[model samples]
Target: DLLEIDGARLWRSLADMARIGATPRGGVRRLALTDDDRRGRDLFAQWCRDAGMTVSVDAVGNLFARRDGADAQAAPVLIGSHLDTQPEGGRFDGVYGVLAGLEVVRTLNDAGIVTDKPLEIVSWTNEEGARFAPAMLGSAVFTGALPLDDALARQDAEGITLGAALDACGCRGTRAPGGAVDAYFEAHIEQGPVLEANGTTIGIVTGGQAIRWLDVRVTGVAAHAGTTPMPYRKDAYFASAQMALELERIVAGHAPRGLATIGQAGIRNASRNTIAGDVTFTVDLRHHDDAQVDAMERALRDACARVAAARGVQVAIDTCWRSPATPFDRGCVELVARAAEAFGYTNERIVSGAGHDAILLARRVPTAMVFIPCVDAEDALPDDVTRGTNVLLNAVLARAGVATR
Candidate 1:
């Protein structure tokens, strides 16, 4: 209670932004670089100006709002997350992080407090891949994980490139992305039920899970279903089913933490009377340990080989992506742990299961993240929102160092 931001003001800011892309069912539809996204950025930038901050945007349209520190030469601390939402996204997902950072800045302004090092809040562009092919383009570019030209050339379903959309929305900034920062922080909703289910208010993110994506295709002879003899048939669909079951079995062998998903499956040119000639399916395997994921992949390959041989089908496995587990900087993670302890907020150390701007920046910068529970159907409980923001406030304050209290 002694160290906190204005909860009501923070709540109001979220509500105000929600109205811009508000859906009939209380969700948002503000895809990246759209007119509504521009409006949302406009309102947020004005607020930053009102709070006595210098605002700027990068070439890829990552918006930055900075508050000067007492030491002009000291590198600024960056606190950021995306402002873009999915086509049918919720209110708090990405918007909360940006606005909560704003609430912290405004709170500091209200107290007339300045830090020893400069502080900046960033609103990353195109975090949701709904409008673009891949997500987190803003952070990816900032961290050098992705190139600028490729990001700008990415197209949407309607054939609009990100560059053209940036031009039309007037959101692109001439300034290049990426620079030196002392430390980085992003406070966000957990996007999972972990915290709320445990009745906890805070999650100190330690790292991100490793992910492996595989595209498997099984080819077999297409023949009339009624005319083909049962034993002579080399059914692609049946082989794919066996492969899917193999994936499940391999993942289960790794136990509680291992995760496996077969999200998409398709049979090419399907007909009721014709056996499937070709079948394609996607596999997503995840775990905290990269080595464990490797073993799982090997098992998957071996099992698929055996199944294909037995089924008389040709199985081909293509690696779409294989991202290793990334751990956050220990010192930055400790700051959040200490902040949570200082506030007496119940907390736990958890690895993020989803990709975020923080994960992209972690390798290049000393980065950490905070999380509170999330609800897909409705607004986050105000107490949880306030508590999570307070933890973020303290963590950022600790990193930036207080010049005036």
Candidate 2:
């Protein structure tokens, strides 16, 4: 390690990062592979270089900064998360992990300490999937689960290709994915209220729940709302509403931790007196157990069909993404636990609700995540204000071996 980091500086870095894509809601809307995202990557690269590290940008625009290890021949021990955010993302959503990794390396540099393994801090590309089709692009490619060409082929709302965007941002490079790694650790905000509500300092995430995304489209005849009889109308909107309700019940019937969400819904036509011709919506299903998620999906499919048949409408379902549940290596979890205990933090094992880059990296490398508390147990909260999640995060990272007290 180089030296202990300046806590004030660390907090300042997070604030500065939040400003890159600051939204009116005091949240961030830095979509993947956008100009704002490139700026964030550049900021991290500059910071790493300032701390005497060599920085590299990959073809997909992921940022990697390295500090030489005591043994250069060994594969680097990597730690990272993403810097991208949703269209309505909070400041601390993904920025916490990226900056916390920076603080870790910075602290080591400040203390002038060196680890036996090379230490690398990474800022993954397009993890929000707000601008891209699927999240965690970099790690997904690294794990060989997604082809690089396919990732580059992804398009945004404006039809801007991810490959084209990377080129426009001058971040497309030759750094191959799957760089050998001894192990990987990620520090992130809990994005939930658990830690804060429980008065805990840190969370040792043992695994992440399986995540599934689906697109549901309902089709019906468009008619004049004032003229069409309610009995004769094939109202897609009503069908959609019914299906949404059943989705809730499906989760209730499934095994514990099953969840279903209708995140996006819109009708083809909307007017004061116009009947909707069609409706499109998104379904986000999740469960700790993959089998339960499958069962839930089956039930949801049946429910949609029944709703359509009853309303004389037609329905179709498309699966956009599916990631099997991933469990972290036990040995790596022990490493984090040992460090948390060493630092005197209250550590608890928990499952992550949201998908993360580690979900992909864990496929090929021994990966683990350390979650720090954040604001708004339900809604994403800003780092400042309230009781302040950063205070606990600082302590947690220091305890987890990412930063020094």
Candidate 3:
């Protein structure tokens, strides 16, 4: 194959980067803009420079490296993923996409081939949002979806602003972020068991599922456990429990694509012997259809109202967040699928269950994603990485336009 990538080299690069924030359990903990993240960025930028690319950082700290193309006037084809990791994230989560793009560049260099359009590899900042409130901060800013001041002012658990952290990290550049882009592509693990269970090597990502979050509060009267009679008791915990069950029942109608989860719950001033006077919980809902998710939200509200009246509780549900279902560009998606077919890899079209930076990019640019199967959240097969990267190489080359055969 003219577009084959060096899997061994890619694996080595992944191992090298993992050492920066290496955790006790073979995971990583390089939170956004931390010292560890700085080291990782430093090393990645060094590697890009060594690969004959020009590296630059933006005001929001998004890192990019470019390989000049034969046609300087053409907009670059962007390939990237985030570099930041969760407090205890797997080594390969977002890092795979970044390094895979690098591998593509390295292969082209080895062949001494030039592309018609420029090719760039990017390592997005603060993608995990583990230390920040929202995920995909780098891409959101790059796509102009998030204002720089708004992002820079965000505080972490210790109340450190992202702006200060960037200043301290010493990588902030004066260059403005977000501009014209030809096409965007990201390769990542499925983050679920779907591809592996189905015996697929590559997942042709069709789109991402819509996400909605709600904060629910149930208030009732507090009473002594011994004195409160079942008939007279106003139990907030019981009502909230009923509401959670109703959510489960409501999603069953939507079946396979529909998902509902009560991620957090707490009782105010909790005591072993006291009836819960107040309870609060978080609800996470997902679906491919916005209308269907709206109906689900309505159904949940109705169910909660019923439970509140029956249990003598006052209930309120606040919509906390909503991200629309993102559909990848048809032409970009076809290129990924065509690459997999050309390479004779087992593949299937699938929807992303988790959010990714590509979701933000798809709004402003022609964007698509590539998924390789991971046996565990913390693991992906070596063969899968190679095969996936090969697909990325072909898909990218198809778009970048090789100057020579």
Q: Per-prediction TM-score, please?
A: 0.93, 0.78, 0.94
Name the candidate that leads on lDDT. Answer: 3
lDDT of 3: 0.92
TM-score of 1: 0.93
| Candidate 2 Cα outliers beyond 4 Å, as residue runs | 1-5, 23-25, 29-35, 87-89, 153-164, 214-244, 265-282, 301-320, 377-405
lDDT of 2 by residue, 288-367 (tens): 88888888898899989988988899999999989799899887877667656655667788788778898888888988
**Cα lDDT tens digits for candidate 3, 290-371:** 8888889999999999999988899999999997888999999999999999999999999999988999899999998999
Candidate 1, position 323, lDDT: 95
lDDT of each: 0.90, 0.77, 0.92
* lDDT per residue (tens digit) for residues 1-405 in model 1: 347899999999999999998999989888999999999998999999999999998999999999999999998889998788988888998889899999999989888888999999999899887898688888998888889999999999999999999999887899888999899998888878788888888899998988999999999999999999999899999999999898899989998768999999999899989999899999999988999988899899999999999999999999999999999989899989988899899999988988888998898999999988876433588888898899889989889989986
In model 1, pairs of residues that clash are none
Question: What ranking emerges by TM-score with the best candidate at the front?
Answer: 3, 1, 2
User: Ten-residue segment with the worst summed lDDT in candidate 2?
Assistant: 384-393
RMSD (Cα, Å) of model 2: 4.9
Candidate 2 accuracy as lDDT? 0.77
